[PDB]
Amino acid sequence: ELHPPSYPWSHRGLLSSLDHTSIRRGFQVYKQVCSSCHSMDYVAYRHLVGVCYTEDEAKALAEEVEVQDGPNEDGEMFMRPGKLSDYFPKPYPNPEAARAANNGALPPDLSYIVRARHGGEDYVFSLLTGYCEPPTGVSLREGLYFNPYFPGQAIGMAPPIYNEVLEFDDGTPATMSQVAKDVCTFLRWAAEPEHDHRKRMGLKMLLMMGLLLPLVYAMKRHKWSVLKSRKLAYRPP
């Protein structure tokens, strides 16, 4: 194994939230890069509302991609422009096609991959940025590559990311690093659409329970005070 470090974040703090601006560029990445071979099936464009995009804007992406829906009255099926209810475009219809599109290897889903891998983000960010030349005395089949963070240090992961592989909207640098930041910020949101709200109840709880707990502890000590101050004696003849 290899243990990733504890890289800080804009959300590591126990009352820290996600930089939604970072998410906004993060979603660009999945569509331009990862959506060719990663099947995020547990998400739709509508969940991006109130998070990174708006109704009409995100809907513009549903108009962009075609989706297989609707039994025609002829008895056949067709393609339409998607909508906000529609989940993401699945790259490939089944897993086996993905194994066929690769060197026998499968891409996992990326919906809950963060919470389904030790370290979560810090694994992933260091995974992409852990590519290096293989060491001496190592050999690998074609298609496989080297990355220390992956178990076995042997993976059919083509390098997906590199500096100036694409460009973003507002125009921030398309480095291998900043891109790697927004994307891991993006995936944590995948398996946690509640982060913005978890901390909110994360905070309401304390200033109640921190406030009640003395009072109940007093009402306890209030009633018990009869016995916390009770004396006795023994007066037979």
Binding site: L14, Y112, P193, M219, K223
Partner: protein, 370 residues
Amino acid sequence: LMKIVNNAFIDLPAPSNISSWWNFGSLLGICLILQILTGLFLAMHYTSDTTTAFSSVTHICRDVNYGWIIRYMHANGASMFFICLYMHVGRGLYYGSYTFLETWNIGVILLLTVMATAFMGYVLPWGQMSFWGATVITNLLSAIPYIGTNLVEWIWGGFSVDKATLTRFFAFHFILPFIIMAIAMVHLLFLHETGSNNPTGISSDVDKIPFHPYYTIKDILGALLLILALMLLVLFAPDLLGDPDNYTPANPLNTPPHIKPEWYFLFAYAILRSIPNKLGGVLALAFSILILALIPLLHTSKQRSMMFRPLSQCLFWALVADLLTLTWIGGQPVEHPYITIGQLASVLYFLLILVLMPTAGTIENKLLKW
């Protein structure tokens, strides 16, 4: 006039030297009702089909209005549940509840009811540890000769785990808390003829007091700590105990490199994993649990408690090392630095219970001449 039976929770005699430990004795009533209450609303959107169950969980955590909390108030609630028990039960040893033979046995049947229940609760979402978590444990029942293959295939609904295995648990799992809900009353009934049992172990009949002002709020104070320690985890570290892998979809054609069920088996699972033999450890497993029914024939001291048996405390807190060790040693893999431990720790468990705690009272009686 069903108002006279509810005096046992209002106007009941009970002692006055009572610690904060016995908060835990009633939190289960709060864990159980809460857990049921949570899970019941939770199953409003569960589905008992392989093709949709894992997704049907995702139907909750994403699309339901504040339902995502309910996955964790329930799930990690089940961890806080067990945290009560092994603080509820080791109590009875450190204080001597176990002389109440009619009650102590009831305290076992709950545990096997639950630990076989919870085993059916981790498996529903098809986490890739659900499957193998159900495979390994259930596979062991093939250890028996001439029937092991039958009952296992019989419970698998075939020759291996499948959709048919799932639904058969979901009903067996949605139900037993209600069976516990009534057995809870039974567990309090045999109590009611004798009442509670102080830390000193002395029959405190002279100093039994009311219940509505004093221990009610005291339990509520504990429930607050429970809800606190529960609200903390769900809000701040819900991924802590619930292993990461269980968010993976199920696939029989691939395993993780490391297997472990949920943390709470691990004191027990390690005992089996210690034994290289298959069957030779299985009977030790349930024996490790069912020893509790066998302890009260080993109350050697004509005292009761252990606040007044200092040597017992030297052993008792040593037992906790073994459990908390087997907890950790269980959740770690099979290699030479760890096998050497469980081959001892397993024996230590049976050893501390059946040799040295009896040996104490046989001595402590002699140290004070009776």
